[PDB]
Protein backbone atom coordinates (compact mmCIF):
# COMPACT_ATOMS: atom_id res chain seq x y z
CA UNK A 1 0.00 0.00 0.00
CA UNK A 2 0.98 3.64 -0.68
CA UNK A 3 2.41 5.99 1.94
CA UNK A 4 3.02 9.74 1.71
CA UNK A 5 5.61 11.30 4.03
CA UNK A 6 5.82 15.07 4.34
CA UNK A 7 7.59 17.56 6.58
CA UNK A 8 4.99 19.91 8.08
CA UNK A 9 4.86 22.82 10.52
CA UNK A 10 2.66 22.36 13.66
CA UNK A 11 -0.64 24.27 13.58
CA UNK A 12 0.14 26.17 16.71
CA UNK A 13 3.17 25.84 18.94
CA UNK A 14 6.88 26.24 18.26
CA UNK A 15 7.88 26.25 14.60
CA UNK A 16 9.57 22.83 14.67
CA UNK A 17 9.18 20.79 11.45
CA UNK A 18 7.83 17.30 11.78
CA UNK A 19 7.64 14.19 9.63
CA UNK A 20 4.06 13.12 8.97
CA UNK A 21 3.15 9.81 7.31
CA UNK A 22 -0.30 9.01 6.01
CA UNK A 23 -2.08 6.52 3.78
CA UNK A 24 -5.63 5.74 2.44
CA UNK A 25 -6.11 9.04 0.66
CA UNK A 26 -9.62 9.75 -0.67
CA UNK A 27 -11.80 12.72 -1.59
CA UNK A 28 -14.64 13.60 0.77
CA UNK A 29 -15.37 17.18 -0.24
CA UNK A 30 -14.95 19.67 -3.11
CA UNK A 31 -15.67 23.05 -1.52
CA UNK A 32 -15.32 25.74 -4.24
CA UNK A 33 -11.83 26.78 -3.17
CA UNK A 34 -10.31 23.30 -3.30
CA UNK A 35 -10.45 19.66 -2.27
CA UNK A 36 -10.86 17.97 1.10
CA UNK A 37 -9.50 14.45 1.63
CA UNK A 38 -9.74 11.95 4.43
CA UNK A 39 -6.38 10.42 5.36
CA UNK A 40 -5.12 7.87 7.84
CA UNK A 41 -2.01 8.55 9.95
CA UNK A 42 0.47 5.70 9.54
CA UNK A 43 1.54 5.30 13.14
CA UNK A 44 -1.45 6.24 15.30
CA UNK A 45 -3.91 4.91 12.71
CA UNK A 46 -6.01 8.03 13.41
CA UNK A 47 -8.04 9.72 10.64
CA UNK A 48 -7.57 13.33 9.64
CA UNK A 49 -8.98 15.67 7.00
CA UNK A 50 -6.62 17.45 4.62
CA UNK A 51 -7.88 20.58 2.86
CA UNK A 52 -5.88 21.29 -0.31
CA UNK A 53 -5.96 24.74 -1.87
CA UNK A 54 -3.97 26.57 -4.58
CA UNK A 55 -1.89 29.30 -3.01
CA UNK A 56 -0.66 32.45 -4.70
CA UNK A 57 2.26 34.18 -3.07
CA UNK A 58 0.77 37.60 -3.89
CA UNK A 59 -0.42 37.28 -0.25
CA UNK A 60 -0.31 35.03 2.81
CA UNK A 61 -3.33 32.71 3.25
CA UNK A 62 -5.90 34.48 5.49
CA UNK A 63 -7.48 31.23 6.67
CA UNK A 64 -4.12 29.75 7.60
CA UNK A 65 -3.12 32.79 9.60
CA UNK A 66 -6.41 32.66 11.50
CA UNK A 67 -6.18 28.95 12.22
CA UNK A 68 -2.64 29.28 13.61
CA UNK A 69 -4.01 31.41 16.46
CA UNK A 70 -6.77 28.97 17.43
CA UNK A 71 -6.88 25.95 19.72
CA UNK A 72 -10.20 25.09 21.38
CA UNK A 73 -12.07 21.86 22.18
CA UNK A 74 -15.02 23.05 20.07
CA UNK A 75 -13.17 24.04 16.88
CA UNK A 76 -11.69 21.68 14.28
CA UNK A 77 -7.94 22.08 14.95
CA UNK A 78 -5.17 22.82 12.47
CA UNK A 79 -2.69 20.06 13.27
CA UNK A 80 -0.09 20.82 10.58
CA UNK A 81 0.18 22.58 7.28
CA UNK A 82 2.65 22.00 4.44
CA UNK A 83 3.24 23.03 0.84
CA UNK A 84 3.16 20.86 -2.29
CA UNK A 85 1.94 20.75 -5.91
CA UNK A 86 2.04 25.53 -5.21
CA UNK A 87 -0.64 24.09 -2.94
CA UNK A 88 -1.21 24.78 0.75
CA UNK A 89 -2.27 21.66 2.65
CA UNK A 90 -4.06 21.96 6.00
CA UNK A 91 -4.15 18.80 8.12
CA UNK A 92 -7.27 18.98 10.31
CA UNK A 93 -9.12 16.92 12.93
CA UNK A 94 -11.55 14.46 11.31
CA UNK A 95 -15.16 14.45 12.56
CA UNK A 96 -17.61 11.98 10.96
CA UNK A 97 -21.05 13.63 11.36
CA UNK A 98 -22.75 17.07 11.20
CA UNK A 99 -25.73 18.90 12.72
CA UNK A 100 -27.21 19.18 9.24
CA UNK A 101 -27.24 15.41 8.69
CA UNK A 102 -28.48 14.52 12.14
CA UNK A 103 -31.26 17.09 12.00
CA UNK A 104 -32.22 15.81 8.55
CA UNK A 105 -32.57 12.19 9.78
CA UNK A 106 -35.13 13.29 12.41
CA UNK A 107 -36.80 15.73 10.03
CA UNK A 108 -37.77 13.12 7.47
CA UNK A 109 -39.13 10.70 10.08
CA UNK A 110 -41.39 13.43 11.40
CA UNK A 111 -39.50 13.60 14.69
CA UNK A 112 -37.57 16.33 16.48
CA UNK A 113 -34.20 15.94 18.11
CA UNK A 114 -34.43 15.28 21.88
CA UNK A 115 -33.86 18.57 23.72
CA UNK A 116 -30.83 17.25 25.64
CA UNK A 117 -28.98 17.25 22.30
CA UNK A 118 -30.25 20.72 21.33
CA UNK A 119 -28.72 21.90 24.62
CA UNK A 120 -25.38 20.12 24.16
CA UNK A 121 -24.91 21.23 20.56
CA UNK A 122 -25.96 24.87 21.01
CA UNK A 123 -23.91 25.27 24.18
CA UNK A 124 -20.74 24.06 22.47
CA UNK A 125 -21.39 26.30 19.45
CA UNK A 126 -21.66 29.35 21.74
CA UNK A 127 -18.43 28.37 23.51
CA UNK A 128 -16.59 28.25 20.19
CA UNK A 129 -18.03 31.67 19.23
CA UNK A 130 -17.09 33.29 22.56
CA UNK A 131 -13.56 32.02 21.95
CA UNK A 132 -13.08 33.25 18.40
CA UNK A 133 -14.85 36.55 19.08
CA UNK A 134 -12.41 37.13 21.95
CA UNK A 135 -9.70 37.54 19.27
CA UNK A 136 -12.02 39.82 17.32
CA UNK A 137 -12.54 37.07 14.70
CA UNK A 138 -16.01 36.66 13.13
CA UNK A 139 -16.74 33.30 11.43
CA UNK A 140 -19.26 34.74 8.93
CA UNK A 141 -20.67 31.37 7.79
CA UNK A 142 -22.40 29.69 10.73
CA UNK A 143 -24.79 27.02 9.42
CA UNK A 144 -25.59 23.33 10.21
CA UNK A 145 -23.14 21.95 7.63
CA UNK A 146 -20.23 23.62 9.43
CA UNK A 147 -21.04 22.11 12.83
CA UNK A 148 -19.27 18.73 12.91
CA UNK A 149 -20.29 16.08 15.44
CA UNK A 150 -18.87 12.89 16.94
CA UNK A 151 -22.01 10.73 17.61
CA UNK A 152 -20.67 8.77 20.59
CA UNK A 153 -19.17 11.61 22.60
CA UNK A 154 -21.62 14.31 21.50
CA UNK A 155 -18.68 16.68 20.98
CA UNK A 156 -19.34 19.45 18.46
CA UNK A 157 -16.60 21.29 16.54
CA UNK A 158 -16.98 24.37 14.37
CA UNK A 159 -15.17 24.20 11.03
CA UNK A 160 -14.42 26.01 7.75
CA UNK A 161 -12.76 29.33 8.44
CA UNK A 162 -12.57 30.26 4.74
CA UNK A 163 -14.89 33.26 5.23
CA UNK A 164 -13.60 34.22 8.69
CA UNK A 165 -12.07 37.61 9.30
CA UNK A 166 -10.93 39.88 12.09
CA UNK A 167 -13.41 42.75 12.22
CA UNK A 168 -11.87 46.14 13.03
CA UNK A 169 -14.25 49.01 13.87
CA UNK A 170 -14.37 51.77 11.29
CA UNK A 171 -13.27 49.31 8.60
CA UNK A 172 -15.74 48.13 5.92
CA UNK A 173 -16.49 44.47 5.20
CA UNK A 174 -18.31 42.74 2.33
CA UNK A 175 -21.99 42.08 2.94
CA UNK A 176 -22.34 39.05 0.66
CA UNK A 177 -20.93 36.49 3.12
CA UNK A 178 -23.07 34.01 5.10
CA UNK A 179 -25.53 31.44 3.72
CA UNK A 180 -29.21 31.52 2.81
CA UNK A 181 -31.52 31.03 5.80
CA UNK A 182 -28.84 32.10 8.30
CA UNK A 183 -28.04 35.67 7.27
CA UNK A 184 -28.71 38.42 9.80
CA UNK A 185 -31.09 41.22 8.65
CA UNK A 186 -28.30 43.81 8.58
CA UNK A 187 -26.57 41.64 5.93
CA UNK A 188 -29.77 41.23 3.87
CA UNK A 189 -30.08 45.04 4.00
CA UNK A 190 -26.49 45.29 2.73
CA UNK A 191 -24.60 46.80 5.71
CA UNK A 192 -20.81 46.89 5.58
CA UNK A 193 -20.20 47.96 9.18
CA UNK A 194 -21.68 44.87 10.88
CA UNK A 195 -20.11 43.21 13.92
CA UNK A 196 -19.56 39.70 15.22
CA UNK A 197 -23.16 39.63 16.35
CA UNK A 198 -24.08 38.35 12.85
CA UNK A 199 -22.64 34.99 14.02
CA UNK A 200 -25.09 35.12 16.96
CA UNK A 201 -28.09 35.66 14.67
CA UNK A 202 -26.93 32.65 12.62
CA UNK A 203 -26.65 30.55 15.77
CA UNK A 204 -30.18 31.67 16.71
CA UNK A 205 -31.40 30.39 13.33
CA UNK A 206 -29.73 27.02 13.98
CA UNK A 207 -31.38 26.70 17.40
CA UNK A 208 -34.81 27.66 16.02
CA UNK A 209 -34.35 25.06 13.29
CA UNK A 210 -33.49 22.22 15.69
CA UNK A 211 -36.61 23.01 17.75
CA UNK A 212 -38.92 23.42 14.73
CA UNK A 213 -37.74 20.57 12.52
CA UNK A 214 -37.13 22.93 9.60
CA UNK A 215 -35.51 26.34 8.80
CA UNK A 216 -37.23 29.25 10.54
CA UNK A 217 -36.57 31.96 7.90
CA UNK A 218 -36.61 30.23 4.46
CA UNK A 219 -36.73 32.05 1.14
CA UNK A 220 -34.86 32.07 -2.16
CA UNK A 221 -34.47 35.85 -2.22
CA UNK A 222 -33.67 38.38 0.48
CA UNK A 223 -37.18 39.76 0.00
CA UNK A 224 -38.80 36.44 0.87
CA UNK A 225 -36.47 35.86 3.79
CA UNK A 226 -37.40 39.28 5.22
CA UNK A 227 -41.13 38.58 4.86
CA UNK A 228 -40.58 35.47 6.99
CA UNK A 229 -38.57 37.39 9.55
CA UNK A 230 -41.22 40.13 9.84
CA UNK A 231 -44.02 37.56 10.20
CA UNK A 232 -42.29 36.47 13.40
CA UNK A 233 -40.49 39.52 14.76
CA UNK A 234 -43.02 42.00 13.41
CA UNK A 235 -42.24 45.07 11.32
CA UNK A 236 -39.04 46.83 12.42
CA UNK A 237 -39.30 50.37 13.78
CA UNK A 238 -37.39 53.08 11.91
CA UNK A 239 -34.98 53.13 14.84
CA UNK A 240 -34.24 49.40 14.50
CA UNK A 241 -33.74 49.93 10.79
CA UNK A 242 -31.09 52.57 11.39
CA UNK A 243 -29.21 50.21 13.72
CA UNK A 244 -28.99 47.54 10.98
CA UNK A 245 -28.63 50.45 8.54
CA UNK A 246 -28.88 50.27 4.70
CA UNK A 247 -42.61 47.99 4.30
CA UNK A 248 -45.54 45.61 4.94
CA UNK A 249 -46.74 46.36 8.48
CA UNK A 250 -47.33 43.21 10.53
CA UNK A 251 -47.67 43.12 14.32
CA UNK A 252 -45.56 40.93 16.62
CA UNK A 253 -46.34 37.19 16.53
CA UNK A 254 -46.19 35.45 19.95
CA UNK A 255 -43.03 33.33 19.96
CA UNK A 256 -44.85 30.51 21.79
CA UNK A 257 -47.31 30.14 18.91
CA UNK A 258 -44.27 29.62 16.66
CA UNK A 259 -43.06 26.36 18.19
CA UNK A 260 -44.87 23.10 18.93
CA UNK A 261 -47.02 22.62 22.08
CA UNK A 262 -44.46 21.11 24.48
CA UNK A 263 -41.48 23.38 23.67
CA UNK A 264 -39.45 24.34 26.79
CA UNK A 265 -40.18 27.96 27.77
CA UNK A 266 -36.44 28.65 28.25
CA UNK A 267 -35.68 27.52 24.68
CA UNK A 268 -38.19 30.02 23.36
CA UNK A 269 -36.84 32.79 25.61
CA UNK A 270 -33.24 32.19 24.43
CA UNK A 271 -34.40 32.31 20.79
CA UNK A 272 -36.08 35.68 21.24
CA UNK A 273 -32.89 37.12 22.80
CA UNK A 274 -30.73 35.92 19.90
CA UNK A 275 -33.00 36.88 17.00
CA UNK A 276 -33.27 40.63 17.55
CA UNK A 277 -33.26 43.30 14.85
CA UNK A 278 -30.90 45.57 16.76
CA UNK A 279 -27.44 43.97 16.53
CA UNK A 280 -26.32 45.38 19.91
CA UNK A 281 -29.43 44.00 21.60
CA UNK A 282 -28.54 40.32 20.91
CA UNK A 283 -26.90 38.29 23.69
CA UNK A 284 -23.16 37.70 23.39
CA UNK A 285 -21.95 34.10 23.06
CA UNK A 286 -20.83 34.02 26.71
CA UNK A 287 -24.17 35.42 27.89
CA UNK A 288 -25.90 32.73 25.79
CA UNK A 289 -23.90 29.93 27.46
CA UNK A 290 -25.02 31.30 30.85
CA UNK A 291 -28.70 31.26 29.85
CA UNK A 292 -31.08 29.18 31.98
CA UNK A 293 -31.97 27.07 28.94
CA UNK A 294 -28.61 25.41 29.59
CA UNK A 295 -29.04 24.86 33.36
CA UNK A 296 -29.51 21.09 32.98
CA UNK A 297 -25.99 20.80 31.50
CA UNK A 298 -24.69 22.27 34.76
CA UNK A 299 -26.44 19.63 36.89
CA UNK A 300 -23.86 17.30 38.46
CA UNK A 301 -26.04 14.25 37.65
CA UNK A 302 -26.68 14.91 33.92
CA UNK A 303 -25.70 12.07 31.56
CA UNK A 304 -25.92 11.34 27.83
CA UNK A 305 -28.77 9.10 26.63
CA UNK A 306 -26.20 6.42 25.70
CA UNK A 307 -25.14 6.39 29.36
CA UNK A 308 -21.73 8.10 28.96
CA UNK A 309 -20.66 11.29 30.68
CA UNK A 310 -21.18 14.60 28.93
CA UNK A 311 -18.11 15.98 27.18
CA UNK A 312 -15.94 18.83 28.55
CA UNK A 313 -18.19 21.81 29.25
CA UNK A 314 -16.63 23.87 32.05
CA UNK A 315 -12.86 24.05 31.32
CA UNK A 316 -13.01 27.81 30.58
CA UNK A 317 -9.77 29.75 29.98
CA UNK A 318 -9.10 33.42 30.81
CA UNK A 319 -9.02 34.16 27.10
CA UNK A 320 -12.44 32.58 26.70
CA UNK A 321 -13.96 34.53 29.61
CA UNK A 322 -12.36 37.93 28.81
CA UNK A 323 -15.52 39.54 27.42
CA UNK A 324 -17.17 39.19 30.83
CA UNK A 325 -15.25 37.52 33.74
CA UNK A 326 -18.09 37.78 36.31
CA UNK A 327 -20.05 35.24 34.23
CA UNK A 328 -17.71 32.57 35.56
CA UNK A 329 -19.81 32.62 38.76
CA UNK A 330 -22.50 31.02 36.59
CA UNK A 331 -20.56 29.19 33.88
CA UNK A 332 -18.42 27.07 36.22
CA UNK A 333 -20.83 25.19 38.53
CA UNK A 334 -20.06 24.29 42.22
CA UNK A 335 -19.26 20.62 41.55
CA UNK A 336 -16.69 22.00 39.09
CA UNK A 337 -15.14 24.15 41.84
CA UNK A 338 -14.62 21.15 44.13
CA UNK A 339 -11.60 18.89 44.62
Residues pairing with 85 in the sheet: none
Regarding 56 and contact with a second copy (CB under 8 A), the answer is: yes
- Return the residue of 19, 43, 220, 239 that touches a second copy, per CB under 8 A: 220
Task: Consult the annotation and say whether 30 binds a ligand.
Answer: yes
Instruction: Work out how close the CB of 89 gets to a second copy at its nearest, in angstroms, rounded to a whole number.
Output: 18
User: Do 129 and 139 touch, CB atoms closer than 8 A?
Assistant: yes
Rounded distance between C-alpha atoms, residue 129 and residue 74, angstroms: 9
Q: Which of 33, 83, 87, 135 binds a second copy (CB under 8 A)?
A: 33
> Half-sphere exposure (CA, 13 Å, Cβ side) for 90?
28
Give the CA count within 13 Å in the CB-facing half-sphere of 183.
25
Q: Which of 166, 179, 235, 272 forms a contact with a second copy (CB under 8 A)?
A: 179
58 binds a second copy (CB under 8 A): yes
* Residue 48 labeled ligand binder: no
Angle, CA of 121, 65 and 315, to the nearest 5°: 35
Could you say which of 141, 220, 224, 299 is catalytic? 141
**Whose Cβ is closer to a second copy: residue 244's or residue 270's?**
244
**139: nearest Cα among 123, 124, 128:** 128
Nearer CB in complex with a second copy: 215/333: 215
Shortest distance (Å) from residue 224 CB to a second copy? 5
Shortest approach of a second copy to residue 226 CB, angstroms?
7
* 226 binding a second copy? (CB under 8 A): yes
Establish whether 28 is an annotated binding residue: yes
Binding status of residue 170 toward a second copy by CB under 8 A: no
- Within residues 106-145, the interface with a second copy by CB under 8 A covers 141, 143
Nearest distance, CB of residue 15 and a second copy, angstroms? 26
Q: Does 190 bind a second copy (CB under 8 A)?
A: yes
How many angstroms separate the CA atoms of 132 and 126, rounded? Answer: 10
Based on the residue annotation, tell me whether 141 is a catalytic residue of this protein. yes
Distances (CA, A) of 84 to 5, 55, 87, 92, 106: 12, 10, 5, 16, 42
Residue with smaller CB distance to a second copy, 26 or 57: 57
Burial class (CB in 10 A: 0-12, 13-18, 19+), 41: middle
119 vs 106: CA distance, rounded Å: 16
Report if residue 248 touches a second copy, rule: CB under 8 A: yes
* 236: DSSP letter: P
Q: Is 35 annotated as a binding residue?
A: yes
Instruction: Give catalytic residues, as residue numbers.
Output: 141
Amino acid sequence: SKVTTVVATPGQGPDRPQEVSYTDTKVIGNGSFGVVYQAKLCDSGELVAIKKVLQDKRFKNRELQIMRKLDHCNIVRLRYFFYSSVYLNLVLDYVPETVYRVARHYSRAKQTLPVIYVKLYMYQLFRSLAYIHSFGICHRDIKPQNLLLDPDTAVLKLCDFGSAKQLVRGEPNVSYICSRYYRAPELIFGATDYTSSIDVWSAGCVLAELLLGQPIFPGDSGVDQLVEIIKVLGTPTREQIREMNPFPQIKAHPWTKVFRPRTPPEAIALCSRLLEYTPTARLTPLEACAHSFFDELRDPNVKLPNGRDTPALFNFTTQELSSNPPLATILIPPHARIQ
